[PDB]
C-alpha cells in the first residue's frame, strides 16, 4: 500500500522468510531510511545486500565499509553501486577510504582503474578524472595494447565531453596520437601509402610514446615512406634506426 513496514511486518513475520524480503526490494520495499530491510538482510553475516538496501536513504555509511572491507571483488555491481554511493556527494572520509581501496595499496589486487575515473566523475572533480584517464591510457599504450588503450581513452574522452567539460590538451594529444596509430593499420590495409605514411610519420615523431614497439613501427614507417615517395623521411627514420 503506502505502508512503511506493514507488508514487511508480515515478511519479518512469515517466520522471517528470506524470499519475501528478496522480492519486496525490487519494486518498492519501505521508507524512513529503509532501516528495516537494512537489519533484515544484514543478519546472519549477510553483509552484501544491506549496502544495496542502504542506498535508499542515509544508512549507507554503515555497509559502505562492509563493501570496502572486501580486499577483492566480492561483487562488481556492488563495487559500482558503492562508487555511486560515494557519488551521492556526502564528502565523507569513507570517500577517501574507497579511493585508497580502489588504489589497492591496502589490498594488493585492485580491479581495473576505470572505477577510479567513474568515482572522480561522480564526485565532479574533473581535474583528477582527466589525469586518471591519461594515466590509464598511457599505461595501456606502454604495455603494447594500442587498440585497447585507444578504446578506453576514447570512451573516457566521450564521457568527459558529454558533460560539456573543457578537455585538457594532454588528453586530446594522447587521443590524437593513439588514433593516428590506429589509422596507420587501416590506411596500410587499403594500400593507400600516402595516408599511412603521413600517419606513420606522425607516430614516429612520438615513437617514445610507443616504447614496446619502437623498433617494428619505425621499420614499417621507412617502408611506407619508401612506397609513398617520402624518401627523405625514410632516410631520416632509418638513420635514427641505426643508433646502437
Amino acid at each position: 500500500s503506502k505502508c512503511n513496514n506493514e507488508a514487511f511486518t508480515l515478511a519479518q513475520q512469515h517466520n522471517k522468510m528470506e524470499i519475501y524480503a528478496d522480492i519486496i526490494g525490487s519494486e518498492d520495499t519501505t521508507n524512513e531510511d529503509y532501516q528495516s530491510i537494512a537489519l533484515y538482510f544484514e543478519g546472519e553475516k549477510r553483509y552484501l545486500q544491506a549496502g544495496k538496501f542502504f542506498l535508499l536513504c542515509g544508512q549507507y555509511s554503515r555497509a559502505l565499509k562492509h563493501f570496502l572491507k572486501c580486499p577483492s571483488s566480492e561483487d562488481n555491481v556492488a563495487i559500482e553501486m558503492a562508487i555511486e554511493t560515494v557519488g551521492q556527494a556526502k564528502d565523507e572520509l569513507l570517500t577517501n577510504q574507497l579511493i585508497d581501496h580502489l588504489l589497492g595499496e591496502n589490498d594488493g589486487m585492485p580491479k581495473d582503474a576505470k572505477y577510479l575515473f567513474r568515482l572522480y566523475m561522480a564526485l565532479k572533480q574533473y581535474r583528477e578524472a582527466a589525469q586518471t584517464a591519461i594515466i590509464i591510457a598511457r599505461e595501456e599504450q606502454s604495455a603494447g595494447n594500442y587498440r585497447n588503450a585507444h578504446d578506453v581513452l576514447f570512451s573516457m574522452y566521450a564521457e568527459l565531453k558529454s558533460q560539456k567539460i573543457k578537455i585538457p590538451s594532454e588528453m586530446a594529444t594522447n587521443l590524437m596520437i593513439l588514433h593516428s596509430y590506429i589509422l596507420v593499420k587501416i590506411h596500410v590495409k587499403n594500400g593507400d601509402h600516402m595516408k599511412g605514411a603521413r600517419m606513420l610519420i606522425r607516430v614516429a615523431n612520438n615513437i617514445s610514446k610507443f616504447p614496446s614497439h619502437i623498433v617494428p613501427i619505425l621499420t614499417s614507417t621507412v617502408i611506407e615512406c619508401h612506397r609513398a615517395g617520402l624518401k627523405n623521411s625514410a632516410f631520416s627514420f632509418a638513420a635514427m634506426l641505426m643508433r646502437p
Partner: protein, 118 residues
C-alpha cells in the same frame, strides 16, 4: 587592446613594426590570445608563458620559448604533458643546448648533450 587608437599612434611614430604587429593581432580572433600576445610584446616573457600554460596551451608556451633561446625551458616544459612531436622537439632542444655550450668553449657540457640528442 583598442587596436585602432594603437594603430593610429603607431602611424604617428612611423613604427611599421607596431603597425604590422597590431594588424597580426587583429587578424587573431581570441581574447587572452591577444592578451598573451601583448604581454609578450612588452617583454614579460615569463608572464606570457604562464598565461599560455593557464589557458591550457603548452603548445604556444613551447613556441614562445622556441622563438627565444630558452632551450632549458623547453626541456623543462617537455618533461610534463604531451605534444604532437616531442621526440624531434627534444632532440632539437638537446642539439641547441649542445651548440649553446660549445660556442662558449664549454665542452664536457655540450658533450652531455649531443648524446641525448643525436
Amino acid at each position: 587592446l583598442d587596436l585602432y587608437t594603437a594603430e593610429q599612434a603607431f602611424v604617428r611614430c612611423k613604427d611599421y613594426q607596431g603597425i604590422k604587429f597590431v594588424k597580426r593581432l587583429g587578424k587573431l580572433l581570441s581574447e587572452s590570445m591577444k592578451q598573451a600576445e601583448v604581454v609578450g610584446y612588452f617583454g614579460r616573457f615569463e608572464e606570457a608563458e604562464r598565461t599560455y600554460l593557464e589557458m591550457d596551451r603548452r603548445d604556444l608556451a613551447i613556441g614562445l620559448r622556441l622563438k627565444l633561446g630558452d632551450w632549458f625551458r623547453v626541456l623543462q616544459l617537455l618533461k610534463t604533458g604531451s605534444g604532437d612531436a616531442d621526440d624531434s622537439l627534444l632532440e632539437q632542444a638537446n642539439n641547441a643546448i649542445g651548440d649553446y655550450f660549445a660556442d662558449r668553449q664549454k665542452w664536457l657540457n655540450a658533450v652531455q648533450y649531443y648524446v641525448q640528442g643525436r
